[PDB]
Design a protein around this ligand. Structure first.
Ligand SMILES: CCCCCCCCOCCOCCOCCOCCO
Ligand SMILES: CCCCCCCCOCCOCCOCCOCCO
Ligand SMILES: CCCCCCCCOCCOCCOCCOCCO
Ligand SMILES: [Cu+2]
Length: 651
């Protein structure tokens, strides 16, 4: 059918979303992982600059989201989350994106209390000796330029695949005409070699690198380097026996090497708390693996397996000789290890196909998590009270979900209850300056976070009308909260009890053969029960309305995004990235797009985002750090009007 641009994604089962990330996207041509998530209702993004935003699902931040690439975990190194996991993903280079909302799966690792996000590349399917190529070129406002290449060749016995991209933009302008610090540049190059010695076997080795740079608005430093190195090995054996339908094994290794500074993408400000050249380098090395068997028999499906992960964080900093004005770069000093995390898990998921219109699913996992504090001193320099200390815990999680198809209509209803326990992450233990009151530090005292949540919803797969809704109510014991105090700003991590609820809904209607309309709504709500106040950093109610006309080889679409004010805030509280401070204003933004299929191999598309050049910001956008030339507590503005044009090739 006619090519179109993606402005919203509907829910396959409202709990599980499956998309093709190679599609043109018209709430702007993405750029990183978080931007692609923005077209799925329930997601919001903390804007940091022009790219590398931090994704938020149902008001939940950070490690509450389990974000995998080809089944592996890429962990960032920046202590202020300049490089969230999505910042390393170029999802045009992926084949499939799956989102599972809520604590409703145990198959993909521990602690995914908010949801699980799986970016995936499918194995090639060559018969006789063949090759294929997909590529794309995009150009747009403010020096935006992206190129993507995905090429593979092989036969029945194996294949070689190469994927790469290079993308960049200059600083954009907001709707008042002001330049925002926001320039960025990214590239990736990855290869996969698959060996398929028979129809029931697959072995695949993957290897890749990337790098990038980005200005950060409202921070004292920019990211001058975001190096990534990746290695993976995957095994899949199908139809091992009549009941043993699949055995999977994989190991992955991911390395991030991040540099931030105040002199390569900006000039040091003499009037700020960083008046001299300064650089910090940090790295993160992650090794992990997973083994899973899938059993199928009678009316039952069982998945069982184990997984393991180790990750290590190191840092080193520059020095500046006051008296002599001599600058010594960070790479002239040795790495200082500060943290090592481990996890080992066992998991199982049992599905009962209780007749054709009823399904019951239950999952369980038990995790042993541990961490060791390797900080020998703290920063003059001071003794670290918990030097070399270790702590560990054993955390069970699980869920049950009931799904029911109605007899007289194409309607599915579901209701599920899940319990997830999450060991605190690097940022919760090592980034805050203080722990809870009376603690020696955060490392010693912050407790695991325990979420119990009811998920429910329905979908209607009619002729002209597809509609879906998914709601949730939950409690969080020991929710990990950051509190901010104004030497510079400093943070304290605490555990609080919280209550959450919300939902997403959407519908799409084929009015005629050519006309189609769709809408979605997303709401999140949170309360801090320990202190009887709102939870911070909760995104406001948001609606989207799309209209598309398609005829033959062409299509045109338009889109309204309408966002309510957020008046539920908790001033000077937030997460390791950002804090609440001001209530946010409502806004509406309008966009246009079109597509033209030129041949079977060549497709063109184009768009205008924010047609009326609205001057606005989003509630979650990063509030400026105190102590610099920019205004503190002001959130990063969104881009003004921008144009873009894209050509897609397929051979
Ligand atoms: C690797 C897969 C193994 C399964 C791990 C699931 O968690 C099991 C936790 O129980 C054993 C962990 O040891 C408990 C720690 O206490 C030590 C007492 O000597
Ligand atoms: C409410 C859960 C229903 C039970 C089904 C889970 C099946 C897993 O077996 O395995 C180790 C997990 O601990
Ligand atoms: C064959 C039985 C499968 C093993 C079930 O293990 C449970 C211990 C899940 C709900 O199980 C009950 C449904 O079975 C009823 C069959 O009509
Ligand atoms: Cu950084």
């Amino acid at each position: 059918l006619a090519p179109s641009v993606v402005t919203g994604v509907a829910q396959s089962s409202p709990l599980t979303i499956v998309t093709n990330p190679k599609e043109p996207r018209q709430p702007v041509p993405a750029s990183d992982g978080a931007d692609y998530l923005k077209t799925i209702p329930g997601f919001a993004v903390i804007r940091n600059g022009g790219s590398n935003g931090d994704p938020v699902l149902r008001g939940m931040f950070g490690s509450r989201l389990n974000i995998l690439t080809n089944g592996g975990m890429m962990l960032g190194a920046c202590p202020n989350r300049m490089d969230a996991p999505t910042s390393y993903i170029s999802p045009e280079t992926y084949d499939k994106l799956t989102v599972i909302k809520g604590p409703q799966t145990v198959l993909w690792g521990p602690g995914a209390s908010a949801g699980t996000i799986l970016f995936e590349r499918e194995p090639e399917r060559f018969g006789e000796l063949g090759s294929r190529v997909n590529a794309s070129l995009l150009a747009g406002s403010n020096g935006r330029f992206d190129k993507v290449l995905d090429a593979a060749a092989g036969n029945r016995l194996g294949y070689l695949r190469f994927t790469g991209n290079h993308a960049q933009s200059d600083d954009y302008e907001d709707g008042a005409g002001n330049t925002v610090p926001s320039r960025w540049k990214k590239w990736n190059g990855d290869v996969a070699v698959g060996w398929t010695p028979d129809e029931d076997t697959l072995i695949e080795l993957t290897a890749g690198k990337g790098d990038g740079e980005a200005r950060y608005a409202g921070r004292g430093m920019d990211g001058s380097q975001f190096k990534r190195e990746s290695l993976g090995l995957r095994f899949v054996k199908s139809n091992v026996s009549d009941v043993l339908e699949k055995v999977e094994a994989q190991v992955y290794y991911n390395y991030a090497d991040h540099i931030m500074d105040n002199f390569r993408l900006r000039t040091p400000d003499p009037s700020s708390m960083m008046p001299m050249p300064m650089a910090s380098q940090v790295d993160r090395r992650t090794l992990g693996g997973r083994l899973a068997a899938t059993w199928r028999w009678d009316d039952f499906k069982l998945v069982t397996g184990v997984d393991a992960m180790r990750n290590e964080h190191r840092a080193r900093g520059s020095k500046y000789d006051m008296m002599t004005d001599y600058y010594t770069d960070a790479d002239q000093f040795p790495w200082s290890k500060d943290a090592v995390f481990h996890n080992y898990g066992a998991f199982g998921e049992l599905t009962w196909f209780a007749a054709e219109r009823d399904r019951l699913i239950g999952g369980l996992r038990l995790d042993r998590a541990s961490v060791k504090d390797y900080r020998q001193t703290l920063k003059h320099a001071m003794a670290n009270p918990t030097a070399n200390d270790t702590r560990a815990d054993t955390l069970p999680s699980g869920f049950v979900r009931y799904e029911h198809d109605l007899a007289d209509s194409p309607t599915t209803l579901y209701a599920g209850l899940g319990h997830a326990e999450r060991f605190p992450d690097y940022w919760e233990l090592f980034s805050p300056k203080r722990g809870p009151n009376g603690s020696v530090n955060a490392f010693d005292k912050i407790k695991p976070e325990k979420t119990t949540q009811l998920d429910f919803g329905l979908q209607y797969n009619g002729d002209k009308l597809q509609a879906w809704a998914s709601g949730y109510v939950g409690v969080v014991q020991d929710f990990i909260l950051f509190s901010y105090r104004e030497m510079g700003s400093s943070t304290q991590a605490t555990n609080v009890d919280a209550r959450i609820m919300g939902g997403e809904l959407g519908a799409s209607y084929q009015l005629t053969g050519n006309w189609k309309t769709d809408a979605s709504l997303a709401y999140a709500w949170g309360k801090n029960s320990s202190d009887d106040r709102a939870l911070p950093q909760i995104p406001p109610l948001e609606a989207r309305f799309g209209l598309t006309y398609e005829e033959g080889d062409w299509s045109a679409g338009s889109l309204w995004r309408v966002v309510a004010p957020q008046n539920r805030i908790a001033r000077d509280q937030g997460n390791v990235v950002g804090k609440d401070f001001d209530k946010s204003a409502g806004f509406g933004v309008f966009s246009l797009n079109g597509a033209y299929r030129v041949t079977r191999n060549v497709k063109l598309s184009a768009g205008v985002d924010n047609l009326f050049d609205k001057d606005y910001t989003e509630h979650l956008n990063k509030a400026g750090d105190a102590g610099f030339g920019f205004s503190a507590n002001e959130t990063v503005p969104e881009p003004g009007r921008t144009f873009w044009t894209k050509v897609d090739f397929s051979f």
